[PDB]
Amino acid sequence: DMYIERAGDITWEKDAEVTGNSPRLDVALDESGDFSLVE
Amino acid sequence: GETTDGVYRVMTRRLLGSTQVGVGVMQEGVFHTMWHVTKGAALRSGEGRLDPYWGDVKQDLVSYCGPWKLDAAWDGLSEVQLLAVPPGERAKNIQTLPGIFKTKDGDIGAVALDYPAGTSGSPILDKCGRVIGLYGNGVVIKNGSYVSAITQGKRE
Numbered sequence A: 001d002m003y004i005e006r007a008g009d010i011t012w013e014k015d016a017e018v019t020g021n022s023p024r025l026d027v028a029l030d031e032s033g034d035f036s037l038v039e
Numbered sequence B: 001g002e003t004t005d006g007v008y009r010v011m012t013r014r015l016l017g018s019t020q021v022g023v024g025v026m027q028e029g030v031f032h033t034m035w036h037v038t039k040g041a042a043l044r045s046g047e048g049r050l051d052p053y054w055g056d057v058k059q060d061l062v063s064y065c066g067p068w069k070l071d072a073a074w075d076g077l078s079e080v081q082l083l084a085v086p087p088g089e090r091a092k093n094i095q096t097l098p099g100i101f102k103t104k105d106g107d108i109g110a111v112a113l114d115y116p117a118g119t120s121g122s123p124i125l126d127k128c129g130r131v132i133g134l135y136g137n138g139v140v141i142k143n144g145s146y147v148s149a150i151t152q153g154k155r156e
């Protein structure tokens, strides 16, 4: 059995931690909704 | 139950203790999450019940109580924020410049941020606070790191 609990408001935070790169990847999406890399 | 707009944790008591299987967005009376989080099962909100209304395994999305309401899109240029809601941890905004998944059917924004699987369904927002998609369906790249698509539905 599944249940939901509130975790917060959806707002943009000024001064949030900035991280993560921006890779450009060739990908394929199958009928089951799984992404895979194409090479 | 609770119908206030916001981000919510998706929990189950079927396994050991209370386990967080994912996250979702409540907007305009509709709960939005990823299909792999609930598998289309009913949800409880206090004494209330949330029934699935629309879903698609290929998009990996599902809406409850009504049709998908989120229609904002990443502009292809600006930084965005993942409003990450990790299991047992407070909601935290993380800012990043999305990369891109190039597919045979077009390009999709992608966020290279690594969180536990139970963080799936956490919203990705633009600078106006609009939800441009959900985090949690993506790929494992060469060095073992995770890259999620910015998954967005269609507002009918």
Ligand SMILES: N#Cc1n[nH]c2ccccc12
Pocket: B114, B115, B116, B117, B118, B119, B120, B135, B136, B137, B140, B146
């Ligand atoms: N494999 C894998 C994952 N690592 N981190 C995730 C976050 C959301 C969904 C899946 C994963």
